[PDB]
Amino acid sequence: GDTGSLAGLQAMADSKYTRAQKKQKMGKIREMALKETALSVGAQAGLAWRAKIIDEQLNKQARNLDAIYDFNSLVLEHNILPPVLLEGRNTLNLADAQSIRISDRTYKVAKQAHFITTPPTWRQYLWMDYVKPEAPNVTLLPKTKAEKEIWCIYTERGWKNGIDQANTILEENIARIKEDFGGMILYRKLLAMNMVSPPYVSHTDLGVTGDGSEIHIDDRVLRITALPELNVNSAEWRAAVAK
Amino acid sequence: IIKTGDIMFAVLDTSVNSDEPGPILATIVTGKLKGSKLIGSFNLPSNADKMVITFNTMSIPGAEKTISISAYAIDPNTARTALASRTNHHYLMRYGSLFASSFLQGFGNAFQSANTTSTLENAVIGLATVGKAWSQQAQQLFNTPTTVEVYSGTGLGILFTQDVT
Amino acid sequence: IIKTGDIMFAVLDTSVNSDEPGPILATIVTGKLKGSKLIGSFNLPSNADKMVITFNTMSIPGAEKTISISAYAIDPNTARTALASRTNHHYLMRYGSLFASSFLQGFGNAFQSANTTSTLENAVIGLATVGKAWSQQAQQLFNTPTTVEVYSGTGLGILFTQDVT
Amino acid sequence: IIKTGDIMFAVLDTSVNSDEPGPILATIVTGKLKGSKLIGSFNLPSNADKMVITFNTMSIPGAEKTISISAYAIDPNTARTALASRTNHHYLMRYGSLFASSFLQGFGNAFQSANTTSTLENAVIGLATVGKAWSQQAQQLFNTPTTVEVYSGTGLGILFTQDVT
Amino acid sequence: DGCCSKMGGINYCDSSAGRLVCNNGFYSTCYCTRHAVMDLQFLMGCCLWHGGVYPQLNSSGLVVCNDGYVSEECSLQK
């Protein structure tokens, strides 16, 4: 007894608990492997089950995902993916003592704009990979009824843990696609604000080409010569106001 | 990196009598190694209080290497080193043969001895002479042990002995 | 490139008595090697509860090469090491010869001993003297083991021991 | 730094009979070293007064080191070196077989000697001749000692001998 | 069971449409060939929308895809 610990120590001076402790010492020394195996297999099974449930729930209502994540609306006129911009407000850094550096707002290019063939979808961002594991193997078995019951409850705890892991992974994917979409819409708003440069491209046309063996009847080569970037001078900045 | 002396498992698919040693392989079914096969051999103990398969040669798929982590066997779901087999194979055969040879010899000689105090004479004849030669041949053959035999569908546990990389 | 300790099939097509060991060939019937032939031999155990074929002389067609991968045998669809043959070939014959020689010896000596308390005398005579030399000759020739014999219409399963290229 | 001769706890999860020595490993669960485990072996004493495990190959996980601290074993919560197992395993079987073979010999000789002062004679016959061969065989086989066997669920204590780092 | 049940029965399979044709001249509701019009949305496997499964048998339980993305949920856990 550690609560009224002097009285508990006077009680543990009695010889009854001294020999009572040995026969429970073996039970408290021989149980961990069953516990850890139950935890591990519960983790695997719960993770798989919750992942399948999540995929079913995701694919149940796919239409509004395509409604909201229309990249094909945001593809530019020369079939160009717009770049990714990141913004920040109330910047403050402390390098060390006697040194504070502050700023109001800030901007940063994350992904440079590049060519595309097809607009992306949400499935590569958000689909959870599913594979059922059909390999149940038991190393050490719970041999008594109390061991089987605690095996069940540690399986239940592992089920909960796998549920937690699946939920965190799903929210991680949500965060990534939110970051990318916010970057593109921020770029569009800043170009509307005339803060960034428009991307500049050219096309060169070449006539009826090819040798005497094989021919191509035209050759138009398109190359982007100027990536979008911000202007460092603020004189060309136009504001906006609503009603 | 494998730590020196933890416990792994395998499932054995092939049976062998304990008479002629040879390569015997188990299928490592769990752990970091999948598709792994383990060949070794066996030894004949003097007493049947345990029986093991000595394992030495490990083959792991994927990469073409043959590491030499060698280990022993414990019984599945017992964590003991005995082998689940039968050992009462040749108690009764040699026991009954020797005892029948003895009883034959005794029958012929003592029912010859009690003659003073023709078919019964021929009983004495047959017992008195087929007891002795079968008795010496039975004591010649009495030393053959009862073999043990593993089975072709039993798993096993394997406790590590050294490190590998 | 063959993994160490995996199981392949072969089919044994010709039979041989286990008295003269020799090169015995099988045709490997499954796996990456097709049309391949293999010679090896056996060994005679003291107790005949299993019988195996050592298999090393491997010939593969396509190119004239002869690899020497050595491996042992298991019974397919049985996964045990015994030979499916007869083992009681020469027990009862020598048993009967010894016991008959004994009965002769006993007949002559005991029914001469019972003389105190023509044809019967000559029966004593004949069995008395033809028991002895036949009995010592029966113990002379009693030592021949019971032969086993592999069969010409049962295949075998070959489990690998080392790697080849 | 470990004090030269302190006490540690080790977890025994696998059993072995005291017939063939081998690398038997326990797992230290206390002290500064976590996840550490230690293999060793046992010895067969002449008398069954106690049975102990010697431990040599010590491994600390994480990093590739394998120290060789030698130690002995004590029974937990007894502070003694005995093993909790059985010791009356093979007294009674050999005692009964030997005394039965004796009683057969005695029955034949004394109940033949009491003949002067058919089926009863055959009883004398059977005991008379099957006593002696079983008597010499039992005197041959009496020499096997009683085996002990440790358990797969009782750990033990370890007292140190040398220093490591 | 009977695909052309309550009909004339199975006549033959059109492979240009991948469908069986009943003896009454109607397209059946069972397919015969693989190369027909399926409507399936649930898919198995992992390293999906990626480089696929990397073919090397790694010693570690972490399995990576060929495009470099790491799929720990396809992998085992610590």
mmCIF file of N, CA and C in Angstrom, chain C residues 59-116:
data_model
loop_
_atom_site.group_PDB
_atom_site.id
_atom_site.type_symbol
_atom_site.label_atom_id
_atom_site.label_comp_id
_atom_site.label_asym_id
_atom_site.label_seq_id
_atom_site.Cartn_x
_atom_site.Cartn_y
_atom_site.Cartn_z
ATOM 1 N N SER C 59 22.318 -34.151 -65.936
ATOM 2 C CA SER C 59 22.528 -33.776 -67.329
ATOM 3 C C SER C 59 21.318 -32.992 -67.820
ATOM 4 N N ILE C 60 21.570 -31.814 -68.368
ATOM 5 C CA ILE C 60 20.539 -30.932 -68.911
ATOM 6 C C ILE C 60 20.789 -30.785 -70.406
ATOM 7 N N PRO C 61 19.769 -30.933 -71.257
ATOM 8 C CA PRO C 61 19.981 -30.759 -72.701
ATOM 9 C C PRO C 61 20.105 -29.302 -73.127
ATOM 10 N N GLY C 62 20.129 -29.069 -74.438
ATOM 11 C CA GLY C 62 20.354 -27.740 -74.969
ATOM 12 C C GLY C 62 21.820 -27.497 -75.262
ATOM 13 N N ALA C 63 22.648 -27.535 -74.221
ATOM 14 C CA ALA C 63 24.097 -27.492 -74.348
ATOM 15 C C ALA C 63 24.714 -28.672 -73.609
ATOM 16 N N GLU C 64 25.846 -29.150 -74.124
ATOM 17 C CA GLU C 64 26.500 -30.333 -73.566
ATOM 18 C C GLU C 64 27.275 -29.936 -72.311
ATOM 19 N N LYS C 65 26.547 -29.860 -71.202
ATOM 20 C CA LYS C 65 27.130 -29.574 -69.902
ATOM 21 C C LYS C 65 26.574 -30.570 -68.893
ATOM 22 N N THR C 66 27.312 -30.756 -67.799
ATOM 23 C CA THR C 66 26.927 -31.725 -66.773
ATOM 24 C C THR C 66 27.189 -31.078 -65.415
ATOM 25 N N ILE C 67 26.144 -30.501 -64.824
ATOM 26 C CA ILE C 67 26.259 -29.911 -63.495
ATOM 27 C C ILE C 67 26.161 -31.028 -62.462
ATOM 28 N N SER C 68 26.630 -30.762 -61.244
ATOM 29 C CA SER C 68 26.709 -31.813 -60.236
ATOM 30 C C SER C 68 26.031 -31.409 -58.933
ATOM 31 N N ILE C 69 24.811 -30.889 -59.024
ATOM 32 C CA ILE C 69 24.025 -30.551 -57.842
ATOM 33 C C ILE C 69 23.601 -31.847 -57.159
ATOM 34 N N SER C 70 23.916 -31.964 -55.874
ATOM 35 C CA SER C 70 23.649 -33.160 -55.094
ATOM 36 C C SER C 70 22.467 -32.901 -54.176
ATOM 37 N N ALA C 71 21.542 -33.855 -54.115
ATOM 38 C CA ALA C 71 20.313 -33.669 -53.355
ATOM 39 C C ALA C 71 19.762 -35.033 -52.947
ATOM 40 N N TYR C 72 18.767 -35.024 -52.058
ATOM 41 C CA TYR C 72 18.164 -36.232 -51.502
ATOM 42 C C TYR C 72 16.704 -36.340 -51.945
ATOM 43 N N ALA C 73 16.017 -37.372 -51.445
ATOM 44 C CA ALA C 73 14.687 -37.733 -51.916
ATOM 45 C C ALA C 73 13.673 -37.797 -50.778
ATOM 46 N N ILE C 74 12.432 -37.415 -51.100
ATOM 47 C CA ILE C 74 11.271 -37.577 -50.231
ATOM 48 C C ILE C 74 10.147 -38.182 -51.060
ATOM 49 N N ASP C 75 9.195 -38.825 -50.394
ATOM 50 C CA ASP C 75 8.083 -39.445 -51.111
ATOM 51 C C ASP C 75 7.039 -38.388 -51.459
ATOM 52 N N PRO C 76 6.745 -38.166 -52.743
ATOM 53 C CA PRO C 76 5.757 -37.145 -53.113
ATOM 54 C C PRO C 76 4.346 -37.577 -52.752
ATOM 55 N N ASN C 77 3.528 -36.585 -52.382
ATOM 56 C CA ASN C 77 2.184 -36.702 -51.806
ATOM 57 C C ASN C 77 2.161 -37.499 -50.502
ATOM 58 N N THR C 78 3.317 -37.759 -49.888
ATOM 59 C CA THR C 78 3.441 -38.460 -48.620
ATOM 60 C C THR C 78 4.315 -37.629 -47.691
ATOM 61 N N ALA C 79 5.342 -37.008 -48.281
ATOM 62 C CA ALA C 79 6.340 -36.167 -47.612
ATOM 63 C C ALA C 79 7.019 -36.906 -46.457
ATOM 64 N N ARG C 80 7.358 -38.169 -46.714
ATOM 65 C CA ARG C 80 8.083 -38.999 -45.762
ATOM 66 C C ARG C 80 9.234 -39.670 -46.494
ATOM 67 N N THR C 81 10.132 -40.279 -45.725
ATOM 68 C CA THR C 81 11.391 -40.768 -46.270
ATOM 69 C C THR C 81 11.421 -42.270 -46.525
ATOM 70 N N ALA C 82 10.351 -42.993 -46.215
ATOM 71 C CA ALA C 82 10.378 -44.444 -46.337
ATOM 72 C C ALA C 82 10.276 -44.877 -47.796
ATOM 73 N N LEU C 83 10.596 -46.146 -48.040
ATOM 74 C CA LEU C 83 10.421 -46.764 -49.346
ATOM 75 C C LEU C 83 9.161 -47.617 -49.332
ATOM 76 N N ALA C 84 8.331 -47.451 -50.362
ATOM 77 C CA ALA C 84 7.107 -48.235 -50.511
ATOM 78 C C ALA C 84 7.463 -49.571 -51.159
ATOM 79 N N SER C 85 7.896 -50.512 -50.323
ATOM 80 C CA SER C 85 8.257 -51.852 -50.770
ATOM 81 C C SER C 85 8.083 -52.818 -49.603
ATOM 82 N N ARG C 86 8.486 -54.064 -49.824
ATOM 83 C CA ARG C 86 8.357 -55.123 -48.836
ATOM 84 C C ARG C 86 9.661 -55.289 -48.062
ATOM 85 N N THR C 87 9.522 -55.588 -46.767
ATOM 86 C CA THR C 87 10.674 -55.719 -45.886
ATOM 87 C C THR C 87 10.769 -57.074 -45.196
ATOM 88 N N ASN C 88 9.808 -57.972 -45.398
ATOM 89 C CA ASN C 88 9.791 -59.278 -44.742
ATOM 90 C C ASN C 88 10.185 -60.403 -45.691
ATOM 91 N N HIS C 89 11.188 -60.165 -46.538
ATOM 92 C CA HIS C 89 11.527 -61.092 -47.614
ATOM 93 C C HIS C 89 12.141 -62.395 -47.108
ATOM 94 N N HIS C 90 13.063 -62.328 -46.154
ATOM 95 C CA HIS C 90 13.855 -63.496 -45.782
ATOM 96 C C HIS C 90 13.953 -63.639 -44.270
ATOM 97 N N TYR C 91 12.820 -63.542 -43.580
ATOM 98 C CA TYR C 91 12.765 -63.858 -42.159
ATOM 99 C C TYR C 91 12.275 -65.275 -41.911
ATOM 100 N N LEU C 92 11.122 -65.607 -42.487
ATOM 101 C CA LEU C 92 10.427 -66.830 -42.121
ATOM 102 C C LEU C 92 11.113 -68.065 -42.691
ATOM 103 N N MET C 93 11.819 -67.923 -43.819
ATOM 104 C CA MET C 93 12.510 -69.057 -44.428
ATOM 105 C C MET C 93 13.647 -69.561 -43.542
ATOM 106 N N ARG C 94 14.514 -68.648 -43.099
ATOM 107 C CA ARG C 94 15.610 -69.038 -42.221
ATOM 108 C C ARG C 94 15.113 -69.396 -40.825
ATOM 109 N N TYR C 95 14.023 -68.752 -40.364
ATOM 110 C CA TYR C 95 13.366 -69.165 -39.123
ATOM 111 C C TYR C 95 12.940 -70.627 -39.177
ATOM 112 N N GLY C 96 12.268 -71.014 -40.264
ATOM 113 C CA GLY C 96 11.798 -72.380 -40.398
ATOM 114 C C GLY C 96 12.922 -73.386 -40.539
ATOM 115 N N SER C 97 13.986 -73.018 -41.266
ATOM 116 C CA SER C 97 15.126 -73.924 -41.413
ATOM 117 C C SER C 97 15.813 -74.181 -40.074
ATOM 118 N N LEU C 98 16.031 -73.117 -39.288
ATOM 119 C CA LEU C 98 16.637 -73.262 -37.966
ATOM 120 C C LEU C 98 15.764 -74.097 -37.040
ATOM 121 N N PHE C 99 14.457 -73.824 -37.034
ATOM 122 C CA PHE C 99 13.569 -74.521 -36.113
ATOM 123 C C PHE C 99 13.402 -75.986 -36.493
ATOM 124 N N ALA C 100 13.434 -76.300 -37.791
ATOM 125 C CA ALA C 100 13.372 -77.694 -38.217
ATOM 126 C C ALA C 100 14.632 -78.453 -37.824
ATOM 127 N N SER C 101 15.803 -77.824 -37.995
ATOM 128 C CA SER C 101 17.056 -78.450 -37.572
ATOM 129 C C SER C 101 17.080 -78.682 -36.065
ATOM 130 N N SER C 102 16.558 -77.707 -35.309
ATOM 131 C CA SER C 102 16.396 -77.855 -33.868
ATOM 132 C C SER C 102 15.528 -79.053 -33.522
ATOM 133 N N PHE C 103 14.321 -79.126 -34.105
ATOM 134 C CA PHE C 103 13.368 -80.200 -33.822
ATOM 135 C C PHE C 103 13.954 -81.571 -34.120
ATOM 136 N N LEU C 104 14.792 -81.652 -35.154
ATOM 137 C CA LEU C 104 15.506 -82.894 -35.433
ATOM 138 C C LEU C 104 16.464 -83.251 -34.298
ATOM 139 N N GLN C 105 17.290 -82.279 -33.875
ATOM 140 C CA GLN C 105 18.236 -82.506 -32.774
ATOM 141 C C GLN C 105 17.524 -82.974 -31.511
ATOM 142 N N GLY C 106 16.435 -82.283 -31.164
ATOM 143 C CA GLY C 106 15.685 -82.614 -29.965
ATOM 144 C C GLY C 106 15.012 -83.965 -30.042
ATOM 145 N N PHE C 107 14.540 -84.345 -31.237
ATOM 146 C CA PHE C 107 13.870 -85.629 -31.382
ATOM 147 C C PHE C 107 14.825 -86.763 -31.152
ATOM 148 N N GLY C 108 16.002 -86.669 -31.764
ATOM 149 C CA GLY C 108 16.977 -87.718 -31.586
ATOM 150 C C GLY C 108 17.464 -87.840 -30.157
ATOM 151 N N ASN C 109 17.827 -86.708 -29.534
ATOM 152 C CA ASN C 109 18.385 -86.813 -28.189
ATOM 153 C C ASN C 109 17.334 -87.206 -27.154
ATOM 154 N N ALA C 110 16.139 -86.608 -27.198
ATOM 155 C CA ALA C 110 15.166 -86.881 -26.151
ATOM 156 C C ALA C 110 14.530 -88.256 -26.318
ATOM 157 N N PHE C 111 14.229 -88.672 -27.551
ATOM 158 C CA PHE C 111 13.660 -90.001 -27.663
ATOM 159 C C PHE C 111 14.724 -91.088 -27.725
ATOM 160 N N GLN C 112 16.012 -90.733 -27.668
ATOM 161 C CA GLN C 112 16.988 -91.716 -27.214
ATOM 162 C C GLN C 112 17.067 -91.749 -25.694
ATOM 163 N N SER C 113 16.889 -90.597 -25.043
ATOM 164 C CA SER C 113 16.965 -90.540 -23.587
ATOM 165 C C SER C 113 15.797 -91.265 -22.935
ATOM 166 N N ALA C 114 14.658 -91.318 -23.617
ATOM 167 C CA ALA C 114 13.483 -92.004 -23.103
ATOM 168 C C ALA C 114 13.489 -93.502 -23.397
ATOM 169 N N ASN C 115 14.636 -94.069 -23.780
ATOM 170 C CA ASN C 115 14.685 -95.485 -24.127
ATOM 171 C C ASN C 115 14.605 -96.391 -22.905
ATOM 172 N N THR C 116 15.002 -95.902 -21.729
ATOM 173 C CA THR C 116 15.081 -96.782 -20.568
ATOM 174 C C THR C 116 13.717 -96.987 -19.923
#
